[PDB]
Amino acid sequence: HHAALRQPQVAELLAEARRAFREEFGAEPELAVSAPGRVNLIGEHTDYNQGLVLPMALELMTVLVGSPRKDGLVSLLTTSEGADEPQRLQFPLPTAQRSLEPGTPRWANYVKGVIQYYPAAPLPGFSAVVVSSVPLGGGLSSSASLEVATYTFLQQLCPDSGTIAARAQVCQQAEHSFAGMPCGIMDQFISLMGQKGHALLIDCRSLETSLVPLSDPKLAVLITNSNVRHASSEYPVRRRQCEEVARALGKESLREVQLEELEAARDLVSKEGFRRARHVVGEIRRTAQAAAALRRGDYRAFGRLMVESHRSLRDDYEVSCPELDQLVEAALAVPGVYGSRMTGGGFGGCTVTLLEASAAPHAMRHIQEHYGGTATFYLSQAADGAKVLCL
Amino acid sequence: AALRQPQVAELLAEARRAFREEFGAEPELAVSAPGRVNLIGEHTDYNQGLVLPMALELMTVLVGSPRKDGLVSLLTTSEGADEPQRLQFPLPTAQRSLEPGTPRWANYVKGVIQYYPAAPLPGFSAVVVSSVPLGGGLSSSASLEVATYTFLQQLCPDSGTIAARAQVCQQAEHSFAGMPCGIMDQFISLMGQKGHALLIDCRSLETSLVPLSDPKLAVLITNSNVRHLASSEYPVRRRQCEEVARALGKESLREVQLEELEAARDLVSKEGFRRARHVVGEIRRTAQAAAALRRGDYRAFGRLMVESHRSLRDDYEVSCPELDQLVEAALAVPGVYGSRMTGGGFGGCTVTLLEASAAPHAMRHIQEHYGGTATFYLSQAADGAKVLCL
Numbered sequence: 031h032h033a034a035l036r037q038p039q040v041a042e043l044l045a046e047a048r049r050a051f052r053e054e055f056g057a058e059p060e061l062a063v064s065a066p067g068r069v070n071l072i073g074e075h076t077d078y079n080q081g082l083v084l085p086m087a088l089e090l091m092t093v094l095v096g097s098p099r100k101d102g103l104v105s106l107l108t109t110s111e112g113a114d115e116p117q118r119l120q121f122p123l124p125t126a127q128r129s130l131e132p133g134t135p136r137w138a139n140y141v142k143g144v145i146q147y148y149p150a151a152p153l154p155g156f157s158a159v160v161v162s163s164v165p166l167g168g169g170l171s172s173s174a175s176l177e178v179a180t181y182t183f184l185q186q187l188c189p190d191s192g193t194i195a196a197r198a199q200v201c202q203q204a205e206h207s208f209a210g211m212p213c214g215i216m217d218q219f220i221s222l223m224g225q226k227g228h229a230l231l232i233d234c235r236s237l238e239t240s241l242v243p244l245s246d247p248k249l250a251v252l253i254t255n256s257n258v259r260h261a262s263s264e265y266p267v268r269r270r271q272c273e274e275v276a277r278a279l280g281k282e283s284l285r286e287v288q289l290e291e292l293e294a295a296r297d298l299v300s301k302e303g304f305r306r307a308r309h310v311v312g313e314i315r316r317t318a319q320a321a322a323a324l325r326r327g328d329y330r331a332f333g334r335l336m337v338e339s340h341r342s343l344r345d346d347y348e349v350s351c352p353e354l355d356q357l358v359e360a361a362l363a364v365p366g367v368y369g370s371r372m373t374g375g376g377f378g379g380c381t382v383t384l385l386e387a388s389a390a391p392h393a394m395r396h397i398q399e400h401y402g403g404t405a406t407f408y409l410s411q412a413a414d415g416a417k418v419l420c421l
Numbered sequence: 422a423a424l425r426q427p428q429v430a431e432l433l434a435e436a437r438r439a440f441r442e443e444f445g446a447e448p449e450l451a452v453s454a455p456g457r458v459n460l461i462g463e464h465t466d467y468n469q470g471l472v473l474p475m476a477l478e479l480m481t482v483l484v485g486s487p488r489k490d491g492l493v494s495l496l497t498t499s500e501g502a503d504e505p506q507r508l509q510f511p512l513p514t515a516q517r518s519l520e521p522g523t524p525r526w527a528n529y530v531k532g533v534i535q536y537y538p539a540a541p542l543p544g545f546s547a548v549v550v551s552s553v554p555l556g557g558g559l560s561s562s563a564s565l566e567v568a569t570y571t572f573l574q575q576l577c578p579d580s581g582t583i584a585a586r587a588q589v590c591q592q593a594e595h596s597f598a599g600m601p602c603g604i605m606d607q608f609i610s611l612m613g614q615k616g617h618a619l620l621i622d623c624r625s626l627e628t629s630l631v632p633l634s635d636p637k638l639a640v641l642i643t644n645s646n647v648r649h650l651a652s653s654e655y656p657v658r659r660r661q662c663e664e665v666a667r668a669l670g671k672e673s674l675r676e677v678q679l680e681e682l683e684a685a686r687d688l689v690s691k692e693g694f695r696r697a698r699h700v701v702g703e704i705r706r707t708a709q710a711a712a713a714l715r716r717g718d719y720r721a722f723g724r725l726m727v728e729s730h731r732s733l734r735d736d737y738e739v740s741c742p743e744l745d746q747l748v749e750a751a752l753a754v755p756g757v758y759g760s761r762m763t764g765g766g767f768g769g770c771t772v773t774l775l776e777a778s779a780a781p782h783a784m785r786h787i788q789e790h791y792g793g794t795a796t797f798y799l800s801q802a803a804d805g806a807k808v809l810c811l
C-alpha cells in the first residue's frame with residue numbers, strides 16, 4: 031500500500047455526490063450518471079491527425095448526480111478542489127434568443143458546451159453536483175470524463191436518438207468551441223466506448239475500433255502523477271504545425287504521410303514542422319505495432335514501443351517535461367518494468383507504466399524516492415464506459 | 422408492423438411483479454442478458470472460425486434475492502418453457518453435485534451454478550423473464566446462462582476474465598444442457614455493444630467492433646415460429662467437421678482452405694466433404710462480409726448472406742422449408758440486400774438486411790408468401806449484460 035497509492039471507489043464516489051447534493055440542494059438527487067477518464071497506452075498526438083490510439087478506460091471517473099428543475103435554471107456545484115473559483119455556478123438555459131457563452135468559471139465552460147450542443151430536446155433545468163476521481167489537468171482526460179458525464183446525464187434529462195460517435199462529436203465540439211481547445215476525438219470515445227478488462231485500438235480516421243485484451247494478473251498498469259502542470263498555448267500550435275505540413279505534402283492528413291515520404295518535403299516543410307510530422311508519422315505506426323505486440327503478449331516489445339514513444343514526444347514533438355522525463359527515467363530503472371511514457375496532452379501530468387505486477391511496489395518506492403516532486407500513483411485496470419447509476 | 426420489444430423498464434417491472442407475487446417480497450437484485458442474431462458465420466464457431474453477431478434488444482431479465490435459507494428456488498415466466506415453470510432444489514456441495522434432469526430449462530441454470538468460479542455462494546430467489554424466443558435462433562440459451570451468471574456475480578462477485586465467464590456458461594450448456602456449443606453466443610452476450618456488430622475470431626478469441634450506425638439500413642429478423650429441435654443433428658455436424666479436420670491432420674477446419682479442400686475429397690466421405698466445404702466456405706465469406714460491411718458495401722454483404730444460406734441449406738443441411746420459404750420471399754423484395762437463416766437452423770429465425778425504407782413492404786411481402794405465421798423483429802444493435810439497479 032503505497033501511501034501515495036490511490037484506490038478510489040465508485041461506491042464511495044456516489045455516496046459523496048449523494049451527500050453534497052443533499053447538502054447543497056436540501057434533497058436527494060433523482061438521477062445518477064458517470065463517465066470514466068482514460069489513459070493512453072500509446073499513440074500520443076495522432077488523434078487529430080487521424081492516427082491510431084490505444085487508450086483504455088479507468089476506474090477513475092466523473093459522477094454527476096442531480097434532478098430536473100421546473101424552475102428553468104441551470105445550477106451546479108463542483109466538489110473538485112482542482113477547479114477554478116467559484117466552485118458553484120448558476121445560469122439560465124439558452125434560448126433561440128440567448129445562447130450560452132463561454133465565461134468564468136472556466137470549468138463551467140465544459141458543462142455549458144455539452145448543454146449548448148446537446149442534440150435532443152426539450153432540455154429541462156437542473157440541479158447538479160459534480161464529483162470526480164480524475165485529477166484535473168493530469169493527462170487522464172478529466173475533460174472528456176466531465177463532458178461525457180454531463181452529456182449522459184442530459185440523456186436522463188432528454189433522451190436522444192443518435193449514434194455514440196455523435197455523442198463524442200458533441201462533447202468534442204463543446205471542448206473546441208467552449209473551452210477553446212481544439213482537441214481530438216480520442217478522449218470522448220474511450221470515455222463512451224470503454225470496456226472491462228480491455229483496451230481500445232481506435233481508428234481516428236475511420237473511427238473503426240478494436241479490442242485488445244488486458245487481463246493479465248502478472249501484468250500491471252501503473253500511472254504516476256507528476257503533480258505538475260506547466261503550454262496549452264502550445265497544443266493548438268502543434269496541431270497547426272502538422273496541419274500545415276500535411277498541407278505542403280499535398281496530403282489530407284499526416285496519416286497519408288510516410289516516414290520515408292516526409293524526407294521528401296524536407297525542403298518543402300519547416301524544420302520544426304519536420305520534427306512534428308516525423309513524430310506523428312512514426313507514432314502512428316508504432317501504435318499499430320504495439321497493439322500487435324500486446325495482443326500477442328509481447329509485453330517486452332510493448333514496453334519498448336512505449337519508450338520509443340516517449341522519446342519521440344520529448345525530442346520531436348516537444349510536449350514532455352523534465353518532471354515527466356524524470357518520472358519516466360526512474361520507472362525505466364526498475365526491474366520488472368516493460369516500459370514507461372508520458373500519457374495524454376503533455377507539458378506535465380502523468381506517465382503510464384507497464385510492468386510486472388509483483389514489481390509494482392518496488393516501482394512505487396524507487397519512483398517516489400527518485401522523483402524530486404510529489405508523486406501520485408494509480409494501479410490501474412481497464413474500466414467500462416459512460417454509464418447510468420440508479421440511485 | 423413490427424413486434425414492439427419491451428424495454429428493460431417493462432421487462433424489469435414484469436420481473437418485479439411475478440417476484441413480489443411469488444415470493445411475497447421486493448427483489449434485491451436485477452440483471453439482464455440480451456439475445457443475439459448472427460449476421461453471418463454460421464456453424465463456424467466450433468471449427469474456430471469467424472462469426473458476425475450483434476446483440477439484440479431482446480434479452481433476459483433476472484430479478485432476485487439471496488437466501489440465508491441456503492437453497493435455490495426459481496420460476497420462469499416463459500410459456501415456451503418446460504413444465505414445471507417452478508423449480509426448487511438444494512445448493513451443490515463437495516458431496517452434492519447438481520444433476521441435470523427436469524425441467525430441462527432448469528439445466529441451464531444449474532450449470533451456471535455448478536460452475537460459478539467463485540465462492541462462497543448463498544441461496545436464492547430468482548424470477549426469470551425474457552423477450553427472446555425460446556429456440557428462435559436468437560440464443561435464448563446464451564441470453565439465460567448469461568443472466569444467471571450475471572446474477573451470481575452479484576451474489577458472490579467474480580475475479581476472472583470475461584472470456585472466463587463465457588467459458589462457464591458454455592461448459593454448463595455443454596455438460597448440463599447436452600448441447601455441445603461453440604463460443605459465439607455467450608461472448609456476444611457479454612461482449613455486445615450498442616450500435617455495433619461483433620467480428621469474433623473463435624480461434625484467437627479476438628474480436629473487433631463493427632459499426633452498424635446507419636439509419637438507412639435495417640436488420641430484419643423474421644420468426645418462422647417453427648421448431649422441428651433436430652438438435653440431434655447438431656452434435657452430429659460437430660463430429661463430421663471434426664472428423665474431416667482429422668483426416669487433414671488439421672487442428673481445426675480453420676486450418677483448411679477452400680482450395681486445399683480438394684485434396685481430402687478422397688480422404689473423406691462425400692457428405693463430410695460438403696460439411697467442411699460449408700465451414701471452410703463460411704469463414705472466408707464471414708471475413709469478406711465484415712470488410713464489406715466496414716466498407717459499407719451492403720450490396721456485397723447481402724450477396725455473401727445469400728451464399729451463406731445456400732451453403733447452409735445445401736452443404737450443411739441445417740435449413741428448413743419454412744426457412745427457405747422465408748428467405749426466398751425476402752430476396753424478392755427490392756431494397757433487400759440479403760437474407761438467410763440464422764442460429765443453429767432446423768427452424769427459428771431468418772435475418773435480413775435491407776433498406777429501412779423497404780421494411781414495411783417486406784414484412785407484408787414475406788407474410789403474404791409465408792404459408793405459416795411469421796413474427797417480425799426490427800433489430801438494433803444493443804449492449805451486453807448489465808447490472809440492473811432497482
Ligand SMILES: Nc1ncnc2c1ncn2[C@@H]1O[C@H](COP(=O)(O)OP(=O)(O)NP(=O)(O)O)[C@@H](O)[C@H]1O
Pocket residue numbers: 092108109110113114136137138140160161162165166167168169170171172173174176217373374375376379
Ligand atoms: N470534475 C471536474 N470539475 C470541474 N472542472 C473540471 C472537472 N474535470 C475537469 N474539469 C475542467 O476540465 C479541465 C481539464 O482540462 P484538460 O487540459 O483537458 O486536462 P486533462 O483532460 O485532465 N488532461 P489530458 O487528458 O491530457 O488532456 C479543468 O481545468 C477544468 O476546467
Ligand SMILES: Nc1ncnc2c1ncn2[C@@H]1O[C@H](COP(=O)(O)OP(=O)(O)NP(=O)(O)O)[C@@H](O)[C@H]1O
Pocket residue numbers: 481497498499501502503525526527529549550551554555556557558559560561562563565763764765766769
Ligand atoms: N427465459 C427462459 N426460461 C426458461 N427456459 C429458457 C429461457 N431462455 C432459454 N431457456 C431454455 O433454453 C432453451 C433455448 O433453446 P435453444 O436450443 O438454446 O435455442 P435458442 O437458444 O433459442 N436458439 P439458438 O441461438 O439457435 O441456439 C429453451 O428451450 C429453454 O429450455
Ligand SMILES: OC[C@H]1O[C@H](O)[C@H](O)[C@@H](O)[C@H]1O
Pocket residue numbers: 073074075076077078171213214215216217374375376
Ligand atoms: O494525444 C494527446 C491528447 O491531448 C489531449 O488529451 C487531447 O484531448 C487528446 O485528444 C489528445 O490529443
Ligand SMILES: OC[C@H]1O[C@H](O)[C@H](O)[C@@H](O)[C@H]1O
Pocket residue numbers: 459462463464465466467602603604605606764765
Ligand atoms: O452458428 C450456429 C450456432 O449454433 C448454435 O446457436 C450454437 O450455440 C452457436 O454456438 C453456433 O454453433
Ligand SMILES: [Mg+2]
Pocket residue numbers: 171172173174213217
Ligand atoms: Mg483533455
Ligand SMILES: [Mg+2]
Pocket residue numbers: 560561562563606
Ligand atoms: Mg442456443
